[PDB]
Design a protein around this ligand. Sequence first.
Ligand SMILES: *[C@H]1O[C@H](CO)[C@@H](O)[C@H](O)[C@H]1NC(C)=O
Ligand SMILES: [Ca+2]
Ligand SMILES: [Ca+2]
Lengths: 307, 74, 4, 4, 305
Amino acid sequence: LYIDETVNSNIPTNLRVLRSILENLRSKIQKLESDVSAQMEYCRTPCTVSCNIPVVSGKECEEIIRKGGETSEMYLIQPDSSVKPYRVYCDMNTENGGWTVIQNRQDGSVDFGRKWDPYKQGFGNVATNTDGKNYCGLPGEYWLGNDKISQLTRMGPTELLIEMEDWKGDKVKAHYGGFTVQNEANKYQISVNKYRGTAGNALMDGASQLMGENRTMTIHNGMFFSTYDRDNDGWLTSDPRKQCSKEDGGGWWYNRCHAANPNGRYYWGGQYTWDMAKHGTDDGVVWMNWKGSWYSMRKMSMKIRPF
Amino acid sequence: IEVLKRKVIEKVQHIQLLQKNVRAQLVDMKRLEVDIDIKIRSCRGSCSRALAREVDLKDYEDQQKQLEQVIAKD
Amino acid sequence: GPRP
Amino acid sequence: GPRP
Amino acid sequence: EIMKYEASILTHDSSIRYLQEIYNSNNQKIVNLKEKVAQLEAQCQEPCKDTVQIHDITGKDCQDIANKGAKQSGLYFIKPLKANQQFLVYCEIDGSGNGWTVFQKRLDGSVDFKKNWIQYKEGFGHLSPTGTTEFWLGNEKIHLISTQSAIPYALRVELEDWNGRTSTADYAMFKVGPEADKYRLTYAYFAGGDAGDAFDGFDFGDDPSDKFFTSHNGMQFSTWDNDNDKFEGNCAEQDGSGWWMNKCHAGHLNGVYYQGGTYSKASTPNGYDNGIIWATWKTRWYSMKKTTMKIIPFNRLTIGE
Ligand SMILES: *[C@H]1O[C@H](CO)[C@@H](O)[C@H](O)[C@H]1NC(C)=O
Ligand SMILES: [Ca+2]
Ligand SMILES: [Ca+2]
């Protein structure tokens, strides 16, 4: 009988708490409405720089630390003089120095969610002038072209030091004394071995806190490079809306899909959750085997070396 | 004359509609947020300056807590 | 992570 | 310069 | 009876419809705000713009390229006749048609020239686009670009005091010997410039040999820890530097860059002179500010054409 009381009682806990959040969210469709111009505007004008190319060059950061190159910064390395030179950032302090940065993370600045080329050629800022000293001694997020990599790794057996530190300070790395990025012909295929390290061999050993069919399909080794227009994912779905790169924001060696997601979306604070992501997948600067599919660390660089 | 509980059970089953609908709303902007905010940082290197804002998921993911109690009316 |  |  | 009025307390009929409205707008609005981003991301798809840039043409030396086109005193990859890796040089073209090339410059005290041997060879510091930027291209590179097939080069010790007036000083078939012999510089004769010839020695009084011991012409290159000078030790280190020492010097450029110039026997680490001197212009205590040094082909010194 009584139900005719939902009118002025049961209902009076809806519209009030409906028109409310449809509104307290309305005043969101605002902030997240202008800012998209309050920063789209201050975009009208690009950012400039001036990387005074130091005197000392080399074939790559290794030969340079062997030519007096001791301060870590913007260098000009020239692998096989059968290809146009190019700037880069060297690491000449952390571990014998001479590490040629290949990718770097420490802020947003550079979106990695691009297509083929940008990944093949190279995108980002290969460091920027150190507010005072006329040279670019501090690294800036970027992804030194693929070719350049697929090539610098071709200088015989090439080491690779993927390091990282998480927001609460802690830090670990993962060295792959055996790393090679195949030619853009084998869809940049990635071969890696001799994994030493404390970060957890998430590229070879696959993601740990999982199992078989679930683990192994988080194997980055043997993997092709894939983008959101270059589908070579380990995931084989006859559907175009489903792809390990269209999701998991940013190209990378995807094997249905990842255990490590460098070049991912940039998540502030580390922890993030599906109810945030463009597609609900764990797309972010993630290294599952260490912090978990839901911790998107602060900085994560991939700097390599010959020998 | 009928005492119709019709224009009730109905004009109340609607609440249930635009209740599930909004839950998507309050979640389309809990992502449009995150996507917008992250895509903004996506310029501090392709654009000059950038603004240092916030987002708060203690509020965005708070409005959700209530819109998740307001369930049960039959 | 992996997929279903 | 000049020394002994 | 009366409560049949419910068709009155039934106002939600539209007290709700005004939501199935404001709602229907937001999402709809989003189809718009989902372009108001699709376009911004693309506006943020490039890198910061960089000033420094490498030009297209390249050849023998700055002078070769500076005569294949050119006109912009900039940086070009040069690969000397009998050379190797086309390292980068900081040229300087005029209006005539002659392309110079520094090999050492000083302007502020931003490159602590006091690097060890293997650094003075491969050079250290940093080039740049314009010019202002202390740098030592490095004797190594200074060699292959001073003996390509052997055609007369020359140094023009350009300078400037801590008071405006700049000098300059030239030399013949300038040439820095291969690391083998060391880096012993070999110029034939002095050729002008009121800069004062301090490579021809200078008598400081201390002893009649102040002049023979502080002559730099044909004096192997000494580093703080690899000195082939004519001393009973390393002048370089004794003064902390890497010049072309003897027993010791007069005309210290790779030396202690001083704020103001004129220094004293107090800052002198070990005591003697080590600043930016040139006895044939200023004394051993007065250091300079500006202080380049640049090669160039000789058959273009008094070209007229
Ligand atoms: C992985 O697949 C599903 C993921 O939801 C899970 O139910 C299953 O137990 C897992 N299989 C193994 C053995 O890893
Ligand atoms: Ca596929
Ligand atoms: Ca000696």
